[PDB]
């Protein structure tokens, strides 16, 4: 236990591990994709054993690339795709079925039914969330409805539930620790964010035995130590944990009320720190927990954009319009049209501020002159436009003006996209020097827990700001582009055809 | 109470690790490609640190996939691309330069000069080999010629030489052990195979200091134990070692005199076991050491075909005629032509039985109706034809009639190619149940050294038979196809153009 901390980032389509020194500098890293299953249209599943294997792989890869040995690791921090739900057998460690991903709509019939039975308001008051298949609760209900015998095993204390943080810590401790942090728990829709406890009324409503549930802890404390007889001959403290979007918020050093970031990945998620009190007005956004450290709980407002990077995957894999995902920026830069085509890629419904689960993907403004380049450019721009919807909502809700947006994520590497984002927002966009701020955030949490870094000030002193994009598009051009987006979304929301 | 053996197969374009149980069943494996460098025409280099990283990765991957723990491995067998040469600093452990691959012709001017100065008869009588850039000797000379200061450091005991086996054992032991086995040693062109020692007269001729050279040991004994603080730990015996083609011979259980195999991979290599006395006539073939075990040394005859699999990589990367390598099987199966097109892919010269370093790749029988499919089929068929050349030479030299050929290697999976091989040879072709008999060979060697398996009879009790291919083409067709090949080769050997 010495001079390095490791972060593991278990993302939607790949896992990553990174080892940092006491300066916050990257010494080694490794990344590996894992299988995505789509058994029925709208369903998305992961095999949790394959997720664990990808994590084992990248932990190995980080050590191999760094030349660092486990005995030198002070702490491990863990961050993850949120909501994605695993249920597993307590004795064998075997998942009962595939994990259901946050992307999946397979549990929508159950969410719909909860709405028809009138629970929307109660759920929102307790959890800060909205009744939707997005969150863990209906994924658990789905698994206990559909996996033969699962409900009875659960009623007999034999099955455990966990989000990915919890699953991984379980794996790493070989079953000794079944824990989750406040930020991940807050995403389950089973957790009361005001009383800070699993909500018994929701549990009863859904017939989920409380014996399935992990204990909830802060985002920065020692949860246990590795056994994992792959982590070599070392018992390393598992010491920081947060949902990926909250990890990014922390890694961006957004510690003060009002500070705001956006992470561009498979989806895009705008999170504002609101401090120790939720927020007077939640309208059209989620109220969630940012992080719990130093005895205190810090809340956040979040607007979720479900489909961002995955729209580009669709172009590649569905339409086969592009050969690779990076090729998309090459094509978009070459677009020659008037910029009047709009793609609203709401494959699973519109996220914030709309939260309209019946919307599907749509395209507008097509003409004979519309080229592949134009269509790909419009697809990329969607995430910038919806980010503005969200950020305007955040100003309205928070009554705070927003002079600056910090940004991170794989997709934020696209300079032209970031310039466009600044241009349409008419606010400065500050891109992180190290785009993987999710992993950095988890490393910070773990480092603070073990005394690797002592104080939030030692973290600040590591801050080395990145590329700044300043707005350079005139008000008339910007107002026109955004007004066309609003009309596109409006028109998308009018298509609500349901068969029979 | 340890119940598994691991084999590491460090090949020409990828490395692979497999864990076997005491019945020989594969429990887990992992394979990883690593960069191939071609700095000039005819040169082929590997970064030895990247090769080490690939082996680290696959050692992890096999543990990860199998669920087995390093404390349960009875011993590790290592097998490798032969001749490939690394020279490194004894103190830093840093290679002085890229390794020079067996494929590389960069040291040809040095080999050429040795032939001009009449050293053929003497090198062959000492080593069983021929003077060619293929073998390690001229590659070490190239490194001492061309890396500034290298000859002086070598002369001062500061640099070590190793084929890949030796490099890997050095890395695994963190610099404790500098060893090589008889089979790998015999391929350097620095090792006297009659006297079983490094040949001083060859070393003086090439000005190679003997302090560079590893100790030479048998193919089955404990060379040392792992440190490798990534091999978790667990100090596991490093216990079997052989050049890849000799490991395959052992893996096929070709333990008796006369028994013969061919391994179809990047190159193809026909090896016949000639027992405890070398073979009487070596004409047109190599005399090499098969393996040393039980205090005895088993010799072998070899015919090497440099370009087999790599002809298909050339179709993919050079001509861009196919999308991936697997696709070649599929194109060849659709070929409609008379089968009268011949491709002699001798990019770096012709191997056994020709050993003509000045021949280059060539193509014959083209007509306006020759399709891509026909071109691809002719390319694949070359290795089958040249294997007949070699097998007929072996029959000539040994007087042994050869009624059966055992086969293995990745490229042997192609049933149409394996049938064609049996067809043109008019002898039965028996494919290994497990195509990676190389790794199996290394495992057998390691297991025998630590008593995991006690005696050769325990090895034979594991034999599970593979697919048999029996000849089914009449004499006239077989004789015409082969005659055409021989004319193609003759014509290739007549093109000997050299500028100036």
UniProtKB/Swiss-Prot annotation, chains A, B:
GO terms for cellular component: cytosol. The keyword Kinase applies. Glycerol binds at residues 82-83, 134, 244-245. Pathway: Polyol metabolism; glycerol degradation via glycerol kinase pathway; sn-glycerol 3-phosphate from glycerol: step 1/1. Gene3D superfamilies: 3.30.420.40. GO terms for molecular function: ATP binding; glycerol kinase activity. ADP binds at residues 12, 16, 266, 309, 410, 414. GO terms for biological process: glycerol catabolic process; glycerol metabolic process; glycerol-3-phosphate metabolic process. It catalyses: glycerol + ATP = sn-glycerol 3-phosphate + ADP + H(+). Sn-glycerol 3-phosphate binds at residues 12, 82-83, 134, 244. SUPFAM superfamilies: Actin-like ATPase domain (SSF53067). The modification Phosphohistidine is found at residue 230. The keyword Oxidoreductase does not apply. InterPro entries: ATPase_NBD, Carb_kinase_FGGY, Carb_kinase_FGGY_CS, FGGY_C, FGGY_N, Glycerol_kin. Activated by phosphorylation and inhibited by fructose 1,6-bisphosphate (FBP). ATP binds at residues 12-14, 266, 309, 313, 410. Keywords: ATP-binding, Glycerol metabolism, Kinase, Nucleotide-binding, Phosphoprotein, Transferase. Pfam families: FGGY_C, FGGY_N. Its EC number is 2.7.1.30. HAMAP family: Glycerol_kin. Key enzyme in the regulation of glycerol uptake and metabolism. Catalyzes the phosphorylation of glycerol to yield sn-glycerol 3-phosphate. Belongs to the FGGY kinase family. Homotetramer and homodimer (in equilibrium). This is Glycerol kinase.
């Amino acid at each position: 236990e010495k001079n390095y901390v490791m972060a593991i980032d278990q993302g939607t389509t790949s896992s990553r591990a990174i080892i940092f020194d006491r300066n916050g500098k990257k010494i080694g890293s490794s990344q590996k994709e894992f299988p995505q299953y789509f058994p029925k249209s709208g369903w998305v599943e992961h095999n949790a054993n394959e997720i664990w294997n990808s994590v084992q792989s990248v932990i190995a890869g980080a050590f191999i690339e760094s030349g660092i040995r486990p005995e030198a690791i002070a702490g491990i921090g863990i961050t993850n795709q949120r909501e994605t739900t695993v249920v597993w057998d307590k004795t064998t460690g075997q998942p009962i079925a595939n994990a259901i991903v946050w992307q999946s709509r397979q549990s929508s019939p159950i969410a719909d039914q909860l709405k028809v039975d009138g629970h929307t308001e109660m759920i929102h008051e307790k959890t800060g969330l909205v009744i939707d298949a997005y969150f863990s609760a209906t994924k658990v209900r789905w698994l206990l409805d559909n996996i033969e015998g699962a409900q009875e095993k659960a009623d007999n204390g034999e099955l455990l539930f966990g989000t990915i943080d919890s699953w991984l810590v379980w794996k790493l401790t070989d079953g000794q620790v079944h824990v989750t942090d406040y930020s991940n728990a807050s995403r389950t829709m089973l957790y009361n964010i005001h009383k800070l406890e699993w909500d018994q009324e929701i549990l009863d409503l859904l017939n989920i035995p409380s014996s399935m549930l992990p204990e909830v802890k802060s985002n920065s404390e020692v949860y246990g130590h590795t056994r994992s007889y792959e982590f070599y001959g070392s018992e390393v403290p598992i010491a920081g944990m947060a949902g990926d979007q909250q990890a990014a918020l922390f890694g961006q050093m957004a510690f003060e009320k009002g500070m705001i970031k956006n992470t561009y990945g498979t989806g895009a998620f705008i999170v504002m720190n609101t401090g120790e009190e939720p927020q007077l007005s939640d309208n059209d956004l989620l109220t969630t927990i940012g992080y719990g450290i130093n005895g205190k709980v810090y809340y956040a407002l979040e607007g979720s954009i479900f489909v961002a990077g995955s729209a580009i995957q669709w172009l590649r894999d569905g339409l086969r319009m592009i050969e690779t995902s990076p090729q998309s920026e090459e094509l978009a830069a070459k677009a020659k049209g008037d910029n009047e085509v709009y793609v609203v890629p709401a494959f699973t419904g519109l996220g914030a501020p709309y939260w309209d689960s019946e919307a599907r993907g749509a395209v507008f403004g097509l003409t004979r002159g519309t080229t592949k380049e134009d269509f790909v450019r419009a697809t990329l721009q969607a995430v910038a436009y919806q980010s503005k919807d969200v950020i305007d909502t955040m100003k309205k809700d928070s009554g705070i003006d927003i002079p600056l947006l910090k940004v991170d994520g794989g997709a934020a590497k696209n300079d032209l996209l970031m310039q466009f984002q600044a241009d349409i927002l008419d606010i400065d966009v500050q891109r992180a020097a190290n785009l993987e701020t999710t992993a950095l955030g988890a490393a910070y949490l773990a480092g603070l827990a073990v005394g690797f870094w002592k104080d939030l000030d030692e973290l600040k002193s590591m801050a080395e700001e990145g590329q700044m994009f300043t707005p350079e598009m005139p008000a008339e051009e910007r107002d026109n582009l955004y007004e066309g987006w609003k009309q596109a979304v409006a028109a998308t929301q009018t298509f609500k055809f349901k068969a029979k």
